[PDB]
Design a protein around this ligand. Structure first.
Ligand code: HEM
Length: 153
């Protein structure tokens, strides 16, 4: 359970993201795919991209980045009361996209790295810890739905 102070730190940096959702989404997906190539292999849509320059040039990748960050922003702005938003996301990622919880850890690491690079004055250690906690809560709640469904592993 995040405190109100923790949530304010999270949403204060997240407001900065929403000024350039597509740029952040590109940086986060590219970092994910470069750091953890097994993740790229889950996207039939992107598995043709073999270099970072090709990733950065893909308009379809930039679109999907906005889709991801729009869904995460809507979850963060619920400050934990996010059951309605998570249900469908856990269900599709478990049963259709076949994404292990560990890859949600990986994309959480990429989000934190990109926020620190783009917003250092709003992403000091207090805010990094609060965002870590918010992303852990997201993973915890998704993992409980995976387990219901037979996919926690
Ligand atoms: C912060 C974490 C994430 C968020 C909020 C998120 C959100 C979404 C949304 C909103 C969609 C489209 C609707 C849906 O199918 O449910 C989607 C699709 C998808 N996601 Fe995620 N996602 C996340 C992490 C991941 C990770 C880590 C992977 C793979 C490593 C992944 C793989 C996919 C795939 C394969 C699709 C279908 C893409 C396509 O072919 O159109 N997601 N995601």
């Amino acid at each position: 359970v995040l405190s109100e102070g923790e949530w304010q730190l999270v949403l204060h940096v997240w407001a900065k993201v929403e000024a350039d959702v597509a740029g952040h989404g590109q940086d986060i997906l590219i970092r994910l795919f470069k750091s953890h190539p097994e993740t790229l292999e889950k996207f039939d849509r992107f598995k043709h991209l073999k270099t970072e320059a090709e990733m950065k040039a893909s308009e379809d990748l930039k679109k999907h980045g906005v889709t991801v960050l729009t869904a995460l922003g809507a979850i963060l702005k619920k400050k934990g009361h996010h059951e309605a938003e998570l249900k469908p996301l856990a269900q599709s990622h478990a049963t259709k996209h076949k994404i292990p919880i560990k890859y949600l850890e990986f994309i959480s690491e990429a989000i934190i790295h990109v926020l620190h690079s783009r917003h250092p004055g709003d992403f000091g250690a207090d805010a990094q810890g609060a965002m870590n906690k918010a992303l852990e809560l997201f993973r915890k709640d998704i993992a409980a739905k995976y387990k219901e469904l037979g996919y926690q592993g």
